[PDB]
Amino acid sequence: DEAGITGTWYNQLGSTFIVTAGADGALTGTYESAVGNAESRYVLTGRYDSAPATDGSGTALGWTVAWKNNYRNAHSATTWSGQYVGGAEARINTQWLLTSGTTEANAWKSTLVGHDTFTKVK
Amino acid sequence: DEAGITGTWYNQLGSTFIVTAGADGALTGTYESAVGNAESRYVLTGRYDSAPATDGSGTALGWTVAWKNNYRNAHSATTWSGQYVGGAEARINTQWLLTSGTTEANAWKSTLVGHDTFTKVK
Amino acid sequence: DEAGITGTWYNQLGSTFIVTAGADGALTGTYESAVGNAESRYVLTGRYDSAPATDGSGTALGWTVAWKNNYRNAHSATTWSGQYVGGAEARINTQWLLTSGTTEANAWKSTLVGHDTFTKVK
Amino acid sequence: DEAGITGTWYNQLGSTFIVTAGADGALTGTYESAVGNAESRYVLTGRYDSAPATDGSGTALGWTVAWKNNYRNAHSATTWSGQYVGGAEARINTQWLLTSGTTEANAWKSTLVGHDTFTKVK
């Protein structure tokens, strides 16, 4: 799944995730959100199961973006946790957590949760 | 917060998170879980807001562990999303998502959610 | 949206949610899961925004099932939190949390998270 | 655990949850949030495992509040999913999802996640 995961992916929001999967389990790349307080590409890094089970199971992985780049700083970070599923209709199915920096008093309202599905087309 | 975040952290479960925060927003290190299908240290990587707001707000960050190392392969990955809060009682308050690789039929039961609080003591 | 929400709904897993929305914000009904340690119908109760905003916004709602009925007891409960979106292709888009009773030592692994989309067909 | 759960509970934010646990698995009561766009008491309803396991395990439960009452309408609903743990230091440990009604374009940012711990004191 180094081969399967490496490449450009697109989610339901029209965001673009460009990733390289290394031999040893690393994920590196860039993320460009179609939504939110984001412009242009942001660094991402993560990890994946480089020796998944061979039984029709997905490959577990995750990655982070901090929403700071040369253009904007949204004082926030998203992590996506999910699985890669190969085949003609390959997919990365994820759930995500977006934490903003907050005061202590507002920490209860720090974190959004959602779900993104990535495909190799659209 | 490069200074504040770099170091060894411990959560409520007795897990140990050893991290280096780079100038440019990178997080690198190792994680050792006190629980679950885990032994010894696992690579982690992540990202943080390297220019947080200066208003008493936390610093947003996140990181991933894939639960594969030389000892075990748990076909799973956790991402932690949270904020660093500095001061005499510094803390990293997180929520996490642990995805296992699953068959398609079992993908509904792929993902655990929880919350870990890291301190510099215990 | 009393009218819109009341009725039979079906999710992507093939589960069936039969609900009545009361004037005053109550949700009552039954749930039958196509997956998991479940058989036949389980009681549900919940709440919805009975005076939503009139601006194209969804209607917030939520409900709970405890997975005990006359046939089985799965020592667990799911809550769905989401929004109803009306129109020709009405939908209830949710995220859910399924907590199992656990020992204290296993409480870290108590809670699954996922997402279900309900429609009036299938 | 009808006996154990029925009563007044307080969380880390200073919110108050007043609940009655019925024989048959129902939860009914009121919730008053110390934070957010909330004033005074809101109806809640939910469900619990009325025949939990007898092995030191918690009792699974959940409940919903829609944030509409006679004073305010926050176009939102929270569900708490968790477990009751009895004994001298009884607790209800929960994770929650707060969904707001949103436009379709903003549905990605509809849902907050967090965690509340309820005790019988404070």
Q: Tokens in use for C29?
A: 């009904």
Q: Which of C65, C83, C113, C116 to mutate to test the interface with D (most CBs of D within 10 A)?
A: C83
Q: How far apart are CA D24 and CA D2, in angstroms?
A: 9
Across the interface, whether the CB atoms of D45 and C49 are under 8 A apart is answered no
For residue A95, count CB atoms less than 10 angstroms from its CB and return exposed for 0-12, middle for 13-18, buried for 19 or more.
buried
With beta carbons under 8 A apart, name residues in chain B contacting C111: 112-114
Residue C22's φ and ψ, nearest 5 degrees, are: -80, 160
- In single-letter form, the type of residue at position C52 comes to P
Q: How far apart are CA C23 and CA C26, in angstroms?
A: 7
| SS3 call for D108 | helix
State which residue of chain A sits closest to C117, comparing Cα positions.
A115
Q: For chain D, which chains pass the contact test of at least 3 CB pairs under 8 Å? A: A, B, C
Closest CA to C9 of C37, C30, C40: C30
Please report which helix (H) or strand (E) contains residue D44, including its range.
strand D42-48
Q: Which of D80, D113, D115, D117 to mutate to test the interface with A (most CBs of A within 10 A)?
A: D113
Q: Tokens in use for D79?
A: 């569900």
Q: Tokens in use for A20?
A: 């390289």
Closest CA to A9 of A44, A39, A38, A55: A44
Q: How far apart are CA A101 and CA B50, in angstroms?
A: 12
For residue B51, count CB atoms less than 10 angstroms from its CB and return exposed for 0-12, middle for 13-18, buried for 19 or more.
exposed
The answer to whether residues B44 and B67 touch, using CB atoms and an 8 Å cutoff, is: no
For residue D89, count CB atoms less than 10 angstroms from its CB and return exposed for 0-12, middle for 13-18, buried for 19 or more.
exposed
Closest CA to C68 of C36, C34, C102, C39: C39
Other CB atoms within 10 A of residue B43 CB: 17
Across the interface, whether the CB atoms of B112 and C109 are under 8 A apart is answered yes
Q: How far apart are CA A97 and CA B9, in angstroms?
A: 21
Q: How far apart are CA B79 and CA B67, in angstroms?
A: 11
Q: Chain D closest CA to A97's CA: distance in Å? A: 8
With beta carbons under 8 A apart, name residues in chain B contacting C112: 109, 111-113
Across the interface, whether the CB atoms of B64 and A47 are under 8 A apart is answered yes
Q: How far is CA D61 from CA C28, C67, D52, D86, in A?
A: 16, 10, 10, 13
- In single-letter form, the type of residue at position A121 comes to V
Q: Tokens in use for D115?
A: 């965690």
The answer to whether residues A76 and B113 touch, using CB atoms and an 8 Å cutoff, is: no
What is the number of helices (H) and of strands (E) in chain D?
Answer: 1, 8
Q: How far apart are CA B97 and CA C77, in angstroms?
A: 19
Closest CA to D30 of C25, B36, B14: C25
Across the interface, whether the CB atoms of C111 and B114 are under 8 A apart is answered yes
- What is the torsional sign of CA B19, A112, D93, A62? negative
Q: How far apart are CA A80 and CA A98, in angstroms?
A: 9
Across the interface, whether the CB atoms of D36 and A114 are under 8 A apart is answered no
- In single-letter form, the type of residue at position C80 comes to W
Architecture per CATH, A1-122: Beta Barrel (2.40)
Q: How far apart are CA A109 and CA A101, in angstroms?
A: 10
Across the interface, whether the CB atoms of C50 and D68 are under 8 A apart is answered yes
- What is the torsional sign of CA C26, D38, A97, D94? negative
The answer to whether residues D106 and D87 touch, using CB atoms and an 8 Å cutoff, is: no
With beta carbons under 8 A apart, name residues in chain D contacting B115: 95, 115
Q: Tokens in use for C76?
A: 């667990």
> Can you give chain C as a three-state secondary structure string?
CHHHHCEEEEECCCCEEEEEECCCCEEEEEEECCCCCCCCCEEEEEEECCCCCCCCCCEEEEEEEEEECCCCEEEEEEEEEEEEECCCCCEEEEEEEEEECCCCCCHHHCEEEEEEEEECCC
Q: How far is CA A52 from CA A59, A95, B73, in A?
A: 6, 20, 8
Q: How far apart are CA A94 and CA A119, in angstroms?
A: 11
DSSP string, A51-94: S--SSS--EEEEEEEEEE-SS-EEEEEEEEEEEEE-STT-EEEE
With beta carbons under 8 A apart, name residues in chain D contacting B113: 95, 113
With beta carbons under 8 A apart, name residues in chain B contacting A99: 60-62, 81-83, 94-95
Q: Tokens in use for B119?
A: 């301190």
Q: Which of D113, D116, D117 to mutate to test the interface with B (most CBs of B within 10 A)?
A: D113
DSSP string, chain B: -HHHHSEEEEETTS-EEEEEE-TTSEEEEEEE-SSSS--S-EEEEEEE-SS--SSS--EEEEEEEEEE-SS-EEEEEEEEEEEEE-STT-EEEEEEEEEEP--STTGGG-EEEEEEEEES--
Cα of C72 vs its chain's centroid, Å: 19
Our CA dihedral for D10, D11, D13, D14, rounded to 10 degrees, sits at: 10
The answer to whether residues C17 and C37 touch, using CB atoms and an 8 Å cutoff, is: no
Across the interface, whether the CB atoms of B36 and C112 are under 8 A apart is answered no
- What is the torsional sign of CA B61, B66, B67, B69? negative
Q: How far apart are CA D47 and CA C62, in angstroms?
A: 12
